[PDB]
Design a binder for this molecule. Sequence first.
Ligand SMILES: O=P(O)(O)OC[C@H](O)CO
Ligand SMILES: [Ca+2]
Length: 234
Amino acid sequence: DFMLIGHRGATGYTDEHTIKGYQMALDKGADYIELDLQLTKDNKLLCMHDSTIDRTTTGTGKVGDMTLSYIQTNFTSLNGEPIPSLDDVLNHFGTKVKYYIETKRPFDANMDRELLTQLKAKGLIGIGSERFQVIIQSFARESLINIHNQFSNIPLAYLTSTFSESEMDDCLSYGFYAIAPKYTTITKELVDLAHSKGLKVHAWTVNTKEEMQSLIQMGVDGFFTNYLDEYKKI
Ligand SMILES: O=P(O)(O)OC[C@H](O)CO
Ligand SMILES: [Ca+2]
């Protein structure tokens, strides 16, 4: 009844968005590994939070300006792990793990298409797939609506830095499964209102046991954390 999400893998303990980090998240008790995706010049999907590789890799530049091959052959994560593609992660873990996958902005129909192509190739969506094995999240309503039009049974989470009744109503209108608000905007009254509308609430990004306890008392259905070991201390 509660979803513990490893934010970019196990970010508090190791490099974000590495297969080593995704594995560490699973080892530390995450229900879901969380991927952020950026579109390469050749319309492949890179596990990368920022539009640019400058902060987290040995390289620089916009992901959209380089081919997947150029990025993976020339650069590594800060501490030397490979920079994984969506394909690399799905090939590594297959149907053994649950994925919480963000389409980063700007909205791009090519990103949505490539995401659905890679998931379908592993049987993670469409016929015979387990509901909740993949949740897709975005700040871009356009990405979630486009995906919902193509694969109506994938649970979708709308990412927001606010938590208003108008946003909950939009989630209902477009058939989204969850609203995913910044955790400091959440109150028990707002969670109860979301629940009354048939929405789940997935809070991000909570990093202390005290703040985890507060969110659980408010009745959130899940949260994203950098520090999975803190959940075992609640
Ligand atoms: O860390 P960000 O910037 O992707 O913020 C959203 C949370 O990670 C939940 O996807
Ligand atoms: Ca994210």
